[PDB]
Amino acid sequence: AVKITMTSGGVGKELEVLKKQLEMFHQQYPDIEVEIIPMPDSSTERHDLYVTYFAAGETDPDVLMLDVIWPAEFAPFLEDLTADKDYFELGEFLPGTVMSVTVNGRIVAVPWFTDAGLLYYRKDLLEKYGYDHAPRTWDELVEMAKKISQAEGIHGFVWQGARYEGLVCDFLEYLWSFGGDVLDESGKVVIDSPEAVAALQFMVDLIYKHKVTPEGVTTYMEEDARRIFQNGEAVFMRNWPYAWSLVNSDESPIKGKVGVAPLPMGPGGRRAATLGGWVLGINKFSSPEEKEAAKKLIKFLTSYDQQLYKAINAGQNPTRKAVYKDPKLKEAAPFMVELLGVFINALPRPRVANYTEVSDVIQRYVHAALTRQTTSEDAIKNIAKELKFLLGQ
């Protein structure tokens, strides 16, 4: 009776699993038909597609698949879900993911699946040199990296330092773990702090002072760091969860020699991880019967059973805390079970409507500091100054 549309958003296995999920949904809700609107695989080619839907205020699509950095931009056009927070059981989701969908105190989407930065390390090299544990502080990681890389003739620590969005993600992990922040609760720019100068200066020192990170890191993206680490040429790597399937596969030279752990903490700081992933929103311009049908679909897809199903069959990490404790997940994918201790410290990038401009500014000055075109102090001061203009403060 009621027909709603949804955007995807998918690779071949991940979309075939979505089709099965929609089948199961239709069995439980026979009066609701769901139609998938095919969407560009590029994140950029698709961000402008949606703004067109809300430029012209279309009634379709009803259910939006949104990148975790888009809620603030789309919030004026998304159905307010704050009254439905218990209907969706948001208290049982990872705290970072609930933050990522709260825009100016309004629940504006529902977390679906998630990602976050973590630390990969050569487990064999750590025990060969007498290290019981993954580094718990950043200074501890420098000490391990320096000792082991010099004795083995490899690099210490590879990560993402090219001028792109990935650099922002790496930088926020240093900033947060050193005790700093971009915006506070009220949303005012607080990045101009000694913690932030310390965090950025630490990134520079990894290259030029301690020499545990190659100078080429200023050109590295995810796969550049991965290839070096996978070939045995780095003790440590910061990356996303996707790399585990690559570096622990059969044709991988380091298979069985890789451990994973949260990123380290800074002096007097936290452990931190930058949140990635996708969320589900409702077009506020759809008819009320399409919206009500859309809420039922989102409740179904983000339920415990469906997050378990998607995790086992498509490999996406759940957003509900409890799914990580399921015994079925522990035997089907024990690596995913280990990510719980990472995801409890994951935080979202700043929730601002003009995020892409905020990111451009951070990329510009952070990369300038990594290339020694400016000092950490000047980079942080300039970021704070520009962000205050961009945010009207």
Asked if residue 271 lies in contact with residue 43, where contact means CB atoms within 8 angstroms, the answer is no
C-alpha–C-alpha distance, residues 65 and 22, integer Å: 15
Kindly state the tokens that stand for 237. Answer: 């790597």
The DSSP bridge partners found for residue 259 are 121
- Give the chain as a 3 state SS string: CEEEEEEECCCHHHHHHHHHHHHHHHHHCCCEEEEEEECCCCCHHHHHHHHHHHHCCCCCCCEEEEECCCHHHHHHHECCCHHHCCCCCHHHECHHHHHHCEECCEECCEEEEEEECEEEEEHHHHHHCCCCCCCCEHHHHHHHHHHHHHHHCCEEEECCCCCCHHHHHHHHHHHHHCCCCCECCCCCECCCCHHHHHHHHHHHHHHHCCCCCCHHHHHCCHHHHHHHHHCCCEEEEEECCCHHHHHCCCCCCCCCCEEEECCCECCCCCCCEEEEEEEEEEECCCCHHHHHHHHHHHHHHCCHHHHHHHHHHHCCEECEHHHHHCHHHHHHCHHHHHCHHHHCCEECCCCCCCHHHHHHHHHHHHHHHHCCCCCHHHHHHHHHHHHHHHCCC
Nearest 5°: the CA angle 339, 344, 345 is 105
Which amino acid, residue 193? Answer: S
Which amino acid, residue 225? Answer: A
The values of phi and psi at residue 298, to 5°, are -70, -40
**Which amino acids are annotated as binding site for Mg(2+), given as ranges?**
59-60, 62, 290
Q: What is the resolution of this structure in A?
A: 2.3
**CA trace torsion 100, 178, 236, 244 (10° rounding):** -10
Q: What kind of experiment solved this structure? A: X-ray
Q: Is 266 exposed, middle or buried (CB count within 10 Å of its CB: 0-12, 13-18, 19+)?
A: buried
**CB-based contacts of 127, cutoff 8 Å, min separation 6:** none
Asked if residue 349 lies in contact with residue 355, where contact means CB atoms within 8 angstroms, the answer is yes
**Which amino acids are annotated as binding site, given as ranges?**
59-60, 62, 290
Which amino acid, residue 69? Answer: I
C-alpha–C-alpha distance, residues 364 and 164, integer Å: 9
Q: Cα dihedral sign for 281, 287, 291, 293?
A: negative
User: In terms of residues, how long is the chain?
Assistant: 393
Report the chain's C-alpha Rg in angstroms: 22
C-alpha–C-alpha distance, residues 62 and 59, integer Å: 7
Domains of the chain: 1-115+276-345 (no CATH), 116-275+346-393 (3.40.190.10)
Asked if residue 74 lies in contact with residue 108, where contact means CB atoms within 8 angstroms, the answer is yes
Asked if residue 390 lies in contact with residue 362, where contact means CB atoms within 8 angstroms, the answer is no
Asked if residue 68 lies in contact with residue 47, where contact means CB atoms within 8 angstroms, the answer is no
Asked if residue 339 lies in contact with residue 324, where contact means CB atoms within 8 angstroms, the answer is yes
Kindly state the tokens that stand for 146. Answer: 């320096």
Phi-psi map region of 280: left, alpha, beta (phi>0 left; psi -120 to 50 alpha): beta
C-alpha–C-alpha distance, residues 130 and 289, integer Å: 63
User: What's the gap between Cα 115 and its chain centre?
Assistant: 5
